[PDB]
């Protein structure tokens, strides 16, 4: 399950707050750290098609625990977030009020 995505707090299927498994935590992702490329990989990986909207600012609620401290530097084509290049991030630059969300289609 490591670096697998889920979407939680969404009203309809294939939408919600982004959470990506990191050890024993389903970690949220700061909107600032996210990208259309990573959102594309997430929608693909979740069998949810393509990105329609990226919503920042904890639109679908706030996560809890460790916010991701690596950035998913996806090229955009990858089948899995686990296959994207990553970069280390400094801790504490975002709160959960910036947890990113995605709406996928198909």
Coordinates of N, CA, C and O in Angstrom, one line a residue:
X1 N 0.8 -1.2 0.0 CA 0.0 0.0 0.0 C 0.9 1.3 0.0 O 0.4 2.4 -0.1
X2 N 2.2 1.1 0.2 CA 3.0 2.3 0.3 C 3.0 3.2 -0.9 O 3.0 2.7 -2.1
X3 N 2.8 4.5 -0.7 CA 2.6 5.5 -1.7 C 1.4 5.3 -2.6 O 1.3 5.9 -3.7
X4 N 0.5 4.5 -2.1 CA -0.8 4.4 -2.7 C -1.7 5.6 -2.3 O -1.7 6.0 -1.1
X5 N -2.5 6.1 -3.3 CA -3.4 7.2 -3.0 C -4.8 6.7 -2.6 O -5.2 5.6 -2.9
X6 N -5.5 7.6 -1.9 CA -7.0 7.5 -1.8 C -7.5 8.9 -1.8 O -6.8 9.9 -1.6
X7 N -8.8 9.0 -2.0 CA -9.5 10.3 -2.0 C -10.7 10.2 -1.0 O -11.5 9.3 -1.1
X8 N -10.6 11.0 0.1 CA -11.6 10.9 1.2 C -12.3 12.3 1.4 O -11.8 13.3 1.1
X9 N -13.5 12.2 1.9 CA -14.3 13.3 2.2 C -15.0 13.9 1.0 O -15.7 14.9 1.1
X10 N -14.9 13.2 -0.1 CA -15.6 13.6 -1.4 C -17.1 13.3 -1.3 O -17.4 12.4 -0.6
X11 N -17.9 14.1 -2.0 CA -19.3 13.9 -2.1 C -19.6 12.8 -3.1 O -20.5 12.0 -2.9
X12 N -18.8 12.7 -4.2 CA -19.1 11.7 -5.2 C -17.8 10.9 -5.5 O -16.7 11.5 -5.3
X13 N -18.0 9.8 -6.1 CA -16.9 8.9 -6.3 C -15.8 9.5 -7.2 O -16.1 10.3 -8.0
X14 N -14.5 9.2 -6.9 CA -13.3 9.7 -7.7 C -13.1 11.2 -7.4 O -12.5 11.8 -8.3
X15 N -13.5 11.6 -6.2 CA -13.2 13.0 -5.8 C -12.9 12.9 -4.3 O -13.4 12.1 -3.5
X16 N -12.1 13.8 -3.8 CA -11.9 14.1 -2.4 C -10.6 14.6 -2.0 O -9.8 15.1 -2.9
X17 N -10.3 14.7 -0.7 CA -9.0 15.1 -0.2 C -8.0 14.0 -0.6 O -8.2 12.8 -0.4
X18 N -6.8 14.4 -1.1 CA -5.7 13.5 -1.4 C -5.1 13.0 -0.1 O -4.6 13.8 0.7
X19 N -5.0 11.7 0.0 CA -4.1 11.1 1.0 C -3.3 10.0 0.4 O -3.8 9.2 -0.5
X20 N -2.0 9.9 0.8 CA -1.1 9.0 0.2 C -0.4 8.2 1.3 O 0.1 8.9 2.3
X21 N -0.4 6.9 1.3 CA 0.1 6.1 2.4 C 1.7 6.3 2.5 O 2.4 6.2 1.6
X22 N 2.0 6.6 3.8 CA 3.5 6.8 4.1 C 3.7 6.2 5.4 O 3.4 6.7 6.5
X23 N 4.3 5.0 5.4 CA 4.5 4.1 6.6 C 3.1 3.9 7.1 O 2.2 3.5 6.4
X24 N 2.9 4.2 8.4 CA 1.6 3.8 9.1 C 0.6 5.0 9.1 O -0.4 4.9 9.8
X25 N 0.8 6.0 8.2 CA 0.0 7.1 8.1 C -0.6 7.3 6.7 O 0.2 7.2 5.7
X26 N -1.9 7.7 6.6 CA -2.4 8.2 5.3 C -2.2 9.7 5.3 O -2.9 10.4 5.9
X27 N -1.1 10.1 4.6 CA -0.7 11.5 4.7 C -1.3 12.4 3.7 O -1.4 12.0 2.5
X28 N -1.8 13.5 4.2 CA -2.2 14.6 3.3 C -1.1 15.2 2.5 O 0.1 15.0 2.9
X29 N -1.4 16.0 1.5 CA -0.5 16.7 0.6 C -0.8 18.2 0.6 O -1.9 18.6 0.3
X30 N 0.2 19.0 0.8 CA 0.0 20.5 0.7 C -0.3 20.9 -0.7 O 0.4 20.4 -1.6
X31 N -1.2 21.8 -0.9 CA -1.6 22.2 -2.2 C -0.4 22.8 -3.0 O -0.2 22.5 -4.2
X32 N 0.4 23.4 -2.3 CA 1.6 24.1 -2.8 C 2.6 23.1 -3.4 O 3.3 23.4 -4.3
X33 N 2.6 21.9 -2.8 CA 3.5 20.9 -3.2 C 3.0 20.0 -4.3 O 3.7 19.1 -4.8
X34 N 1.7 20.2 -4.7 CA 1.1 19.3 -5.6 C 1.2 19.9 -7.0 O 1.7 21.0 -7.2
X35 N 0.8 19.2 -8.0 CA 0.9 19.6 -9.4 C -0.2 18.8 -10.2 O -0.7 17.8 -9.8
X36 N -0.5 19.4 -11.4 CA -1.3 18.7 -12.4 C -0.7 17.3 -12.7 O -1.4 16.3 -12.9
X37 N 0.6 17.2 -12.8 CA 1.3 16.0 -13.2 C 1.0 14.9 -12.1 O 0.7 13.8 -12.4
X38 N 1.2 15.3 -10.8 CA 0.9 14.3 -9.8 C -0.6 14.0 -9.7 O -0.9 12.8 -9.4
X39 N -1.4 14.9 -9.9 CA -2.9 14.7 -9.9 C -3.2 13.7 -11.0 O -4.1 12.8 -10.8
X40 N -2.6 13.8 -12.2 CA -2.8 12.9 -13.3 C -2.5 11.5 -12.9 O -3.2 10.5 -13.2
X41 N -1.3 11.3 -12.3 CA -0.8 10.0 -11.8 C -1.8 9.4 -10.8 O -2.3 8.3 -10.9
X42 N -2.2 10.3 -9.8 CA -3.2 9.8 -8.8 C -4.5 9.3 -9.4 O -5.0 8.3 -9.1
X43 N -5.1 10.1 -10.3 CA -6.4 9.8 -10.9 C -6.2 8.4 -11.7 O -7.1 7.6 -11.6
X44 N -5.1 8.3 -12.4 CA -4.8 7.1 -13.2 C -4.7 5.9 -12.3 O -5.4 4.9 -12.5
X45 N -3.9 6.1 -11.2 CA -3.6 5.0 -10.3 C -4.9 4.5 -9.6 O -5.1 3.3 -9.3
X46 N -5.8 5.5 -9.3 CA -7.0 5.1 -8.6 C -8.1 4.6 -9.5 O -9.2 4.3 -9.1
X47 N -7.8 4.4 -10.8 CA -8.7 3.9 -11.8 C -9.9 4.9 -12.0 O -11.0 4.5 -12.3
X48 N -9.5 6.2 -11.8 CA -10.5 7.3 -11.9 C -10.3 8.2 -13.1 O -10.9 9.2 -13.2
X49 N -9.5 7.7 -14.1 CA -9.4 8.4 -15.4 C -8.5 9.6 -15.3 O -7.3 9.4 -15.0
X50 N -9.0 10.8 -15.6 CA -8.2 12.0 -15.8 C -8.6 13.1 -14.8 O -9.7 13.1 -14.3
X51 N -7.8 14.1 -14.6 CA -8.0 15.2 -13.7 C -9.0 16.2 -14.4 O -8.8 16.6 -15.5
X52 N -10.1 16.5 -13.6 CA -11.0 17.6 -14.0 C -10.6 18.9 -13.3 O -10.5 20.0 -13.9
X53 N -10.5 18.8 -11.9 CA -10.2 20.0 -11.1 C -9.3 19.6 -10.0 O -9.3 18.4 -9.5
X54 N -8.4 20.5 -9.6 CA -7.5 20.4 -8.4 C -8.0 21.5 -7.5 O -8.1 22.6 -7.9
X55 N -8.4 21.1 -6.2 CA -8.9 22.1 -5.3 C -8.0 22.2 -4.1 O -7.8 21.2 -3.4
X56 N -7.5 23.4 -3.8 CA -6.6 23.5 -2.7 C -7.4 24.0 -1.5 O -8.6 24.0 -1.5
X57 N -6.8 24.2 -0.4 CA -7.3 24.9 0.8 C -8.3 24.0 1.6 O -9.3 24.5 2.2
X58 N -8.0 22.7 1.7 CA -8.8 21.7 2.5 C -10.3 21.8 2.1 O -11.2 21.8 3.0
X59 N -10.6 21.8 0.8 CA -11.9 21.9 0.3 C -12.8 20.8 0.8 O -14.0 21.0 1.2
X60 N -12.2 19.6 0.8 CA -12.9 18.3 1.2 C -12.6 18.0 2.7 O -12.6 16.8 3.1
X61 N -12.2 19.0 3.5 CA -11.8 18.8 4.8 C -10.3 18.6 5.0 O -9.6 18.5 4.0
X62 N -9.9 18.7 6.2 CA -8.5 18.6 6.6 C -8.2 17.1 7.0 O -9.0 16.4 7.7
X63 N -7.0 16.7 6.6 CA -6.4 15.4 7.1 C -5.9 15.6 8.5 O -6.1 16.6 9.2
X64 N -5.1 14.6 8.9 CA -4.5 14.6 10.2 C -3.2 13.8 10.2 O -3.0 12.9 9.3
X65 N -2.3 14.2 11.1 CA -1.0 13.6 11.3 C 0.0 14.2 10.3 O -0.2 15.3 9.8
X66 N 1.1 13.5 10.0 CA 2.1 14.0 9.2 C 1.7 14.4 7.8 O 1.2 13.5 7.0
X67 N 1.8 15.6 7.4 CA 1.7 16.1 6.0 C 3.0 15.6 5.3 O 4.1 15.6 5.8
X68 N 2.8 15.2 4.0 CA 3.9 14.7 3.2 C 5.0 15.7 3.3 O 4.8 16.9 2.9
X69 N 6.3 15.2 3.5 CA 7.5 16.0 3.5 C 8.4 15.6 2.3 O 9.6 15.8 2.3
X70 N 7.8 14.9 1.3 CA 8.4 14.7 0.0 C 7.4 15.3 -1.0 O 6.2 15.1 -0.8
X71 N 7.9 15.8 -2.1 CA 7.2 16.3 -3.2 C 7.2 15.3 -4.3 O 8.3 14.8 -4.7
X72 N 6.0 15.0 -4.8 CA 5.9 14.1 -6.0 C 6.1 14.8 -7.2 O 5.2 15.5 -7.8
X73 N 7.3 14.7 -7.8 CA 7.8 15.4 -9.0 C 7.5 14.5 -10.2 O 8.4 14.3 -11.1
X74 N 6.2 14.1 -10.3 CA 5.8 13.2 -11.4 C 6.0 14.0 -12.8 O 5.8 15.2 -12.9
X75 N 6.3 13.2 -13.8 CA 6.4 13.7 -15.2 C 5.0 13.8 -15.7 O 4.7 14.6 -16.6
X76 N 4.1 12.9 -15.2 CA 2.6 13.0 -15.5 C 2.1 11.7 -16.1 O 0.9 11.5 -16.1
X77 N 2.9 10.9 -16.7 CA 2.5 9.6 -17.4 C 2.5 8.4 -16.5 O 2.1 7.3 -16.9
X78 N 3.1 8.5 -15.3 CA 3.4 7.3 -14.5 C 2.1 6.6 -14.0 O 1.1 7.3 -13.8
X79 N 2.2 5.3 -13.9 CA 1.1 4.5 -13.5 C 0.9 4.5 -12.0 O -0.2 4.2 -11.6
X80 N 1.9 4.9 -11.3 CA 1.8 4.9 -9.8 C 2.6 6.1 -9.2 O 3.7 6.4 -9.8
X81 N 2.2 6.6 -8.1 CA 3.0 7.7 -7.4 C 4.3 7.1 -7.0 O 5.3 7.9 -6.9
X82 N 4.4 5.8 -6.7 CA 5.6 5.2 -6.3 C 6.7 5.2 -7.4 O 7.9 5.0 -7.1
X83 N 6.3 5.5 -8.6 CA 7.2 5.5 -9.8 C 7.6 7.0 -10.1 O 8.5 7.2 -11.0
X84 N 7.0 8.0 -9.4 CA 7.4 9.4 -9.7 C 8.7 9.7 -9.0 O 8.9 9.3 -7.8
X85 N 9.6 10.5 -9.6 CA 10.6 11.2 -8.8 C 10.1 11.9 -7.6 O 9.0 12.5 -7.7
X86 N 10.8 12.0 -6.5 CA 10.5 12.7 -5.3 C 11.6 13.6 -4.9 O 12.8 13.3 -5.2
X87 N 11.3 14.7 -4.2 CA 12.2 15.6 -3.7 C 11.9 15.8 -2.2 O 10.7 15.9 -1.8
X88 N 12.9 15.9 -1.3 CA 12.7 16.1 0.1 C 12.3 17.6 0.3 O 12.8 18.5 -0.3
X89 N 11.3 17.8 1.2 CA 10.8 19.1 1.5 C 11.1 19.4 3.0 O 11.2 18.5 3.8
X90 N 11.2 20.7 3.3 CA 11.3 21.1 4.7 C 10.0 20.9 5.4 O 8.9 20.8 4.8
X91 N 10.0 20.6 6.8 CA 8.8 20.3 7.5 C 8.2 21.7 7.9 O 8.8 22.7 8.1
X92 N 6.8 21.6 8.0 CA 6.1 22.7 8.7 C 5.7 23.9 7.9 O 5.2 24.9 8.5
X93 N 5.9 23.9 6.6 CA 5.6 25.0 5.7 C 4.1 25.2 5.4 O 3.7 26.3 5.0
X94 N 3.4 24.1 5.6 CA 1.9 24.1 5.4 C 1.2 23.5 6.6 O 1.8 22.7 7.4
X95 N 0.0 24.0 6.8 CA -0.9 23.4 7.8 C -1.9 22.5 7.0 O -2.0 22.5 5.8
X96 N -2.7 21.7 7.7 CA -3.8 20.9 7.1 C -4.8 21.8 6.4 O -5.6 21.3 5.6
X97 N -4.9 23.1 6.7 CA -5.8 24.0 6.0 C -5.5 24.1 4.5 O -6.3 24.7 3.8
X98 N -4.3 23.6 4.1 CA -3.9 23.7 2.7 C -3.9 22.3 2.0 O -3.5 22.1 1.0
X99 N -4.5 21.3 2.7 CA -4.6 19.9 2.2 C -5.3 19.9 0.8 O -6.4 20.4 0.7
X100 N -4.6 19.3 -0.2 CA -5.1 19.4 -1.5 C -6.2 18.3 -1.8 O -6.2 17.3 -1.1
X101 N -7.1 18.6 -2.7 CA -8.1 17.7 -3.2 C -8.1 17.6 -4.7 O -7.7 18.5 -5.4
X102 N -8.7 16.5 -5.2 CA -8.7 16.3 -6.7 C -10.1 15.8 -7.0 O -10.8 15.0 -6.2
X103 N -10.6 16.2 -8.2 CA -11.8 15.6 -8.8 C -11.4 15.0 -10.1 O -10.9 15.7 -11.0
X104 N -11.5 13.7 -10.2 CA -11.2 12.9 -11.4 C -12.4 12.5 -12.1 O -13.5 12.5 -11.5
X105 N -12.3 12.2 -13.4 CA -13.4 11.7 -14.2 C -13.0 10.5 -15.1 O -12.0 10.6 -15.9
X106 N -13.7 9.4 -15.0 CA -13.9 8.3 -15.9 C -13.1 7.1 -15.4 O -13.6 5.9 -15.6

